[PDB]
Amino acid sequence: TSWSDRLQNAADMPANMDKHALKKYRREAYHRVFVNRSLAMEKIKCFGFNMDYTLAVYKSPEYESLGFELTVERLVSIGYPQELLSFAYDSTFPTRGLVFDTLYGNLLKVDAYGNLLVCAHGFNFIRGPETREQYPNKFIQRDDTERFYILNTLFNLPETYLLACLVDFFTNCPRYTSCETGFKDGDLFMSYRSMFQDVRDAVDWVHYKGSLKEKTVENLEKYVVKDGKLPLLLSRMKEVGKVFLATNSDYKYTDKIMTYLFDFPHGPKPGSSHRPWQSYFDLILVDARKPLFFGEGTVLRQVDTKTGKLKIGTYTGPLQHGIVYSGGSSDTICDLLGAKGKDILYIGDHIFGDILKSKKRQGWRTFLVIPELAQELHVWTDKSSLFEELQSLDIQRRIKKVTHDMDMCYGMMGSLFRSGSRQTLFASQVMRYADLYAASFINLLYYPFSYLFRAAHVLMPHES
Amino acid sequence: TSWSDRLQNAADMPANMDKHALKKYRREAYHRVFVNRSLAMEKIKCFGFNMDYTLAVYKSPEYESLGFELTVERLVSIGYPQELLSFAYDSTFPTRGLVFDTLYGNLLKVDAYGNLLVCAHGFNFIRGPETREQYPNKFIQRDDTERFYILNTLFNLPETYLLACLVDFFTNCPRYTSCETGFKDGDLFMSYRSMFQDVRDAVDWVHYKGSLKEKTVENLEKYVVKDGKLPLLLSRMKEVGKVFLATNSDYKYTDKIMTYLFDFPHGPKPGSSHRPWQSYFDLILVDARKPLFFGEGTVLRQVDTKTGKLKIGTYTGPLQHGIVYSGGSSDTICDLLGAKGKDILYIGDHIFGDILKSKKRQGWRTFLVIPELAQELHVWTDKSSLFEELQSLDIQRRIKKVTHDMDMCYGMMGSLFRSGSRQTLFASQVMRYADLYAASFINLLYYPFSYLFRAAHVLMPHES
Amino acid sequence: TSWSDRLQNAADMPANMDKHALKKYRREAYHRVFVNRSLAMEKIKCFGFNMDYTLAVYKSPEYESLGFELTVERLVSIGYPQELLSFAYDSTFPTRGLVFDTLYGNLLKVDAYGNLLVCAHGFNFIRGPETREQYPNKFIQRDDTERFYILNTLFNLPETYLLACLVDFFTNCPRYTSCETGFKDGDLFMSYRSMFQDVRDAVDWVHYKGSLKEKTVENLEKYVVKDGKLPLLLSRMKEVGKVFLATNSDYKYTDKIMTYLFDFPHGPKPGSSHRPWQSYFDLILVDARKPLFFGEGTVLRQVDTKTGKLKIGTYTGPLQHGIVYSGGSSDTICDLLGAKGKDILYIGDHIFGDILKSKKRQGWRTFLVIPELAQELHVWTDKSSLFEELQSLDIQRRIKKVTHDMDMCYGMMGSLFRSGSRQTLFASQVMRYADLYAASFINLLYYPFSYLFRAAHVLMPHES
Amino acid sequence: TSWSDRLQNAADMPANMDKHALKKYRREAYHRVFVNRSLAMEKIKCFGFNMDYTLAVYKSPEYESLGFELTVERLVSIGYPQELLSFAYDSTFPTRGLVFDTLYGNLLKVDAYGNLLVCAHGFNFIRGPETREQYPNKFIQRDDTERFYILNTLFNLPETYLLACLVDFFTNCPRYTSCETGFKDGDLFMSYRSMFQDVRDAVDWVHYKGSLKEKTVENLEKYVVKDGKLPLLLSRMKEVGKVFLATNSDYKYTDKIMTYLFDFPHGPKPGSSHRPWQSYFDLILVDARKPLFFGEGTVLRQVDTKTGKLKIGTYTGPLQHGIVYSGGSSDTICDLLGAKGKDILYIGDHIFGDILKSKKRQGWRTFLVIPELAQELHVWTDKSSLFEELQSLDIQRRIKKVTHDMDMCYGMMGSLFRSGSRQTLFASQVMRYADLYAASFINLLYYPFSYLFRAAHVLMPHES
Questions:
Q1: Start-to-end CA span in chain C (Å)
Q2: Do A78 and C310 count as a contact with CB atoms less than 8 A apart?
Q3: All partners of chain A with 3 or more CB pairs under 8 angstroms
Q4: Burial A364-403 (b: 16+ CB within 10 A, else e)
Q5: D396 touching chain C per CB within 8 A
Q6: Beta carbons of C212 and C206 less than 8 angstroms apart
Q7: Chain D residues in contact with C136 (beta carbon < 8 A)
Q8: In 10 A of CB B399, how many CB atoms?
Q9: Which residue segments constitute the domains of chain A, with CATH numbers given?
Q10: What is its main location (chains A, B, C, D)?
Q11: Which residues contact A304 (CB under 8 A, 6 or more apart)?
Q12: Burial status of residue A321 (CB atoms within 10 A of its CB: 0-12, 13-18, 19 or more)
């Protein structure tokens, strides 16, 4: 059962908007919105969205496997060995948020302070004492971005697994000699760093010059979750405020995806006339170039929605009905919608490019969609006995074993949010920058128009 | 009663090292070490120190007033008007950690997300609605370091007050015309930014070319707290590990200050022979240039301790008894003491340059000394009824009034750690980067050699 | 008669290697090598080449017109108006080396000191007094590379004309309003700068993602000059030294072009067996990335010449027979050929990326190929009476008229080397950085193996 | 006979302003203005000056020796060995414009292309073949400013000699071991680079915090050339245009120096009333911060000429009589004097900071003062037989000997302008960027108000 199976199962349900049903529905962990900082929904005047893995939730593991296959094909096309074609995407290996160390070719799971929680070289998991040879303080400086790449996004899940596949392959292939920082093949030396660069280049190519989008839009039922409650929630948001889209994708792809997301024989509710997806938005902006978008951005352009090309020139006019923007900056949104940052709830899936940056640079309110939570919540509740035992032991060898047993329930790289009793960097960033979070933003449907999301005030140790 | 009065009162007490007395002493809030993250003291192999406001605690408000007077004199010397000489340092106005906005000339108290908690233009406190003209989202981007300067250090306390004095003076002096971003005097325009730059320049000059150090070392009993328990604690640290000094100050000043700090007719305990301050340290390093020290640092030099000058050349030798280093980097300490970062407890007063940077760049364990806590703890316990009422009301106009009444007990700029129920940026940084903290590191004396400092594990909302 | 007609006419001639014929041939201006600094050919141990417009001389105006058409088609494809399709390349307008001012949309011909010699807005040539409104000192700061782009290369000739076409078109099209820095079309504003950026982007796209190379290699007799004396000269160079190729082009294109350049039924001389082009080179390097090549360069790779793809890994081996390199740096050449810079004569057509940079960064000896000189020499000798009259007048209105009459013989933008008696920036750079220069490097064939190219010593005014 | 003796000898002469005497006087090489590019004096509307070594010509070798002594004293004060005190400035060693190579500790004389003409390690002159070990191509990349420092200014003459003294001293002192890149003293290693940095720091300190200015202004007759014709020339310039001062020095020093330069019992001519130096200038600007001055500069300030301090604020007013400016940019001059660049003749001694930068960045006309030419002209004419023989030989061992014999007449580092028949970088920069040049700008006195300075037009080799 993948997290997208859970999402699609809930997506298939019709909305029962009886007040008592909603209040009961939201109490269930899977339909709940979780709260890091208090947020009064009545103060929100604009609801903003990205598209990928928020509105358009790509099905798992089908989409990751497609991106993996095309990335492998691209690497082989540029001269990587044929054996790469025998790889096959394995969703049980990668957890999101791992750090690839380009010096030693390791995938690392770290806490918020750069402490090592898991270390794998290829598919070999390196235990604590053996990591000290390469990591004498069991620690990395995360912000050394020349050395470390943090595989933060759901789009990074295939390349997370591919990196481990490649290290595994070159390590065990007799044509190559394993060295500390790469692989030697006679008069050729491939460092883990140049390997990583090829992989990054190939992933980028697949998404922006290859056939990934084309293969996606030709079989949208295979690749994209569809939920009839999406138009209902957006229509209700538009009754009490403004709704905008700000996506890094271009207009042609956005139009294809959004048209599918709204392709029902009805509008917001069953029995209502169907409405075009654009009608649900007060402002539509593509080619956003987040996170640069939240600083100086790029020049504001207008999409010719007939041809899908940009009109020539910087757009200097006002917000018009039916206009579609390209580029610009977050100030564009604020000026055109007459909003200040704390009036905006921005709903995204990119912990860095959507949530961290809109919070820190603009003071927007933030809703982080975490698709894997749809399944991790089930593992967390089903295996709570493991965690509680671990808590009790905390109050050594038994600790490591329960930690391992708990973690393996999530996959070979453990929970997105912890390893045993130790929280991941990703978990710490969710708590710090996401005001609200959930497996899907659809869970906002089950809360009244002026709900007060509440979180406990924080006290320092000397204040307790 | 200043915080240094509290510190000096505790400093005057002799150490009762009876186990039961210590356990009772540490229970009292004023002699306690507070814990943000668990720390097993038996794992610490090296204890590191800065000097200023950690070993050498400068008396308040005498030292701030001295630095204020010399800074004013420097500004007048370069052509600021004579009326500056009528200013007098007022310790009730500044709270540490305020942000000077060089665009509009305001001192701001903000939370961790850049939200405005207090705004003062000169000595005029600007209420919420009036701040929206300059701060439409009641928000600043803290990391716009061209515009905002965060007055983070105890050395910044005089210039915090001086900035408000200057804005107040120019605003109310008839020779000048107040403008949005500065003051006009006929054909001269002084922006708040250039004013701020002059003040910064003058503070730097006073500390490094003026008479501040000279005036300090000629009356050390007036300006520096002295505690006979300092040699005792350091001697006990040296019994179980290594002890090092890493200060930004130069050797001549360090020697004068440290000699005074150890100038008792005895050594670690009464009745013992006096020992030179250097004998308490396995490694002494001056001109550290933190925070650069925790990255590439500077070249390692050797101090000629006879002349107080640097020997010519990069020092390439080993750790020798009696050698004093200059410059280098944190890797110097680790290599020479054979330590890894998590073996080190570094004790400092600079939330950024000592604690944040040693944690994030090197994974050192951290102890933050917060001198003002020595008094803020008394206000917190004496006025707990105010905070509890505020907590109860949280569960509008009454809220603002109790908030104001609570805050004014700390000074015109409120507590270092909060305004009402809202935590400051400074408080959030203490919690995030200081593993331990206290009004003085001397409180470590009251804990056994292998104490386990404990903090509760953190859980995400969906895990609760 | 284009300069490539002249080159092809000389290329059709067989080589008469009788000593007396050669000495007579080289005396003629069209077959001469011109000398800025003395160079003893016997000291040259390596002869280096780029490919484009040196070995592969593209025919004019056919090649410029092809690149122009494809660039226009690309701009229309991205949304420029259909009227662009009515443009047609006009070789009489552009002279190489003009500066496009992106602020005011002008093409400028300047001297070495940034003084304006010619100014055209579209096809309107702006006389001296009218240029002072935009250029108060009749001067530009050439190195303000954010504002000025110097159209230095033969590849820039189509975009030189296209920029003037576009300014002309938008200026005279009623849908647009002309402004100081661009064109307004209702709520769209296209600055000359963003227009220029589109043009640059389109030129780059045409060369590296469009069909330019494909259209070139499918009709090489139309697009590329072919000379049976090329293998003869290279074979004679290899008898007395080493020969290398260092091109920015990739291997697949280089192989197609070079195979055509050597496709005769004979080798170096008529009657000799044909030899593959690679056999003429001691070292072959593609993807050179000049000018970066002459600093740190890029990592050295090996071309798999069977597949045309790069082998995986950095190449760490020695110079091997038949190996083809990719990337690297100029130090690669020096180390593998055992040469120092002054042992190398590097023959190129890029005044900046080939000649200036190899001279200034490495002290290579330099030979600049200037294809247009093949025709400009004819204009210079045929119209010498105009220049001599101008010289005599110099020793006002008559001066301007003779200047105009002289310049128009070269085209609407005058000689590459001067306007009247004033030398261009390009001329000054040739003299400063090109040790030798000629319309074709083939003119080296007509000089003996150890010729001493001589230039007069320079004296300062006070030394004369 | 130093060049300042020559200057002072001519300075002692009264001005004979009879037209025929002037025309005869200017024909003599020593009173001539030399011309690199034609300049019509009637087009000049503003005459601009720096002060140091233009208006205030410091006497040689007294001033160099003073700066040398104070720099040595500063180095000893910071811990360099006592033997430095036995050094004594020797004007026969340094020639201006040498390059210190901080990697290998050599002084190099180079041509415009970075080719080695002279190489000295300490006082050991390294012959051609031996330089190839460190300089395999007998070539340096001058613009590698991390490695090479070009000792361009007359202020650099003492540190040129001091660098050679230090390398010589450490090389021959038994306490130190000579290494390729520095000196080892047990556990200390001093690289030539850190040595160079100390020297630079000490020179800067001596000029801006030490006693150099103080010692200069207390004995101005010893240290500064004085010429009664200076007020005459400036007064005549003011009759036909505007006159401005733009100096890097501060106002207090400028006032002391300029007051001395004008301290005669008369004004422009004998018998006329004395006038204050300021009255000779339409615009006075100090703290210019050239070369930054010729780009964005610094904010414009006003000097309070009563106190010598800056008024507080940016000066926003107009040009007023008696106002003195500080900072600003070259656009300040142009706007306030209503001038364009080619209307300005700027007279300076800094080949880079005055002449190169005003030419390249602003298109100013330029006059370079070269004080040493006052003597080098005498050597050039007295030893012309040596140069002519060298010219004849050029048309091997005899060549080297005549080259050495010629060069030694100028000093151990040869002529500022050449070594034998090879021109220096400095000579090439004079020709390229100085429109006019002379040993003193006073030679402009001997030319009529609207003289046309003429230089021959330049022709390319193919145009001859």
A1: 43
A2: yes
A3: B, C
A4: bbbbbbbbbbbbbbbbbeeeeebbeebeeeeeeeeeeebb
A5: no
A6: yes
A7: 340
A8: 14
A9: 3-57+224-372+433-453 (3.40.50.1000), 62-217 (no CATH)
A10: cytoplasm
A11: A310, A311, C79
A12: exposed
Assess whether chains D and C touch, using the rule of 3 or more C-beta pairs within 8 angstroms. Answer: yes
Classified as helix, coil or strand, B222 is helix
Chain D residues closer than 8 Å to B190 by CB: 312-314
CA distance B346 to C371: 69
C130 Cα to chain A: minimum distance (Å): 28
Q: If you measure CA to CA, which chain C residue comes closest to D462?
A: C34
The answer to whether the Cα torsion of B220, B222, B224, B229 is positive or negative is positive
Q: With contact defined as beta carbons under 8 Å apart, do A441 and A139 qualify?
A: no
Q: How were these coordinates obtained?
A: X-ray
CB atoms inside a 10 Å sphere around CB D209: 11
Contact indicator for D140, D99 with CB cutoff of 8 Å = yes
Rounded Cα distance between C382 and C184, Å, is 47
Question: Rounded CA gap, D55 and B135, in Å?
Answer: 53
Q: Are B250 and B85 in contact (CB under 8 A)?
A: no
Q: Can you tell me which residue has the tokens 């129920």?
A: B421
Residue of C nearest to D426 (CA): C460
Structure tokens at C240: 């007395």
The per-residue b/e assignment along C218-239, b for 16 or more CB within 10 angstroms, e otherwise, is: eebeebbbbbbbbbbbbbbbbe
Query: What would the two tokens of residue C376 be?
Result: 């400009």
Q: Say which of B113, B394, B462 has its CB closest to residue A29.
A: B462
Chains in contact with C, counting 3 or more C-beta pairs less than 8 Å apart as contact: A, D
Q: Please name the amino acid found at residue D390.
A: L
Question: Are the C-beta atoms of residues B75 and B85 closer than 8 Å to each other?
Answer: no
At what resolution in Å was this solved?
2.0
Cβ contact B366:B345 at 8 Å: yes
Q: Is the omega angle on the peptide bond into residue C231 within 30 degrees of 0, that is, cis?
A: no
Chains that touch B (3 or more CB pairs under 8 A): A, D
Q: Point out residues after which chain D has a gap (C–N over 2.5 Å).
A: 395
Angle between helices B373-382 and B3-12 (to 10 degrees): 100
Contact predicate A387/A371, CB 8 Å: no
- Contact call for B36 and A461, based on CB within 8 A: yes
* Joined tokens for residue D102: 């901080």
Residue with tokens 């170039």: A289
Structure-token match 């504002």, residue found: C147
Dihedral of CA A37/A41/A46/A51: which sign? positive
Task: Confirm if D116 and D135 have CB atoms less than 8 A apart.
Answer: yes
Nearest to D197 by CA among D98, D102, D65, D106: D102
Query: What does DSSP say about strands B283-286 and B242-246: parallel, antiparallel, or unpaired?
Result: parallel
B377 at interface of A, judged by CB pairs closer than 8 A: yes
Tell me if D378 sits within 8 A of D6, measured CB to CB.
yes
- Cα torsion C440, C443, C445, C451: sign: negative
Q: Which residues contact C71 (CB under 8 A, 6 or more apart)?
A: C158, C159, C162, C199, C202, C203, C206
CA distance to partner chain D, nearest, from residue B248 (Å): 19
Within 8 A by CB and 6+ apart from A216, the residues are: A58, A63, A66, A223, A224
B246 three-state secondary structure: strand
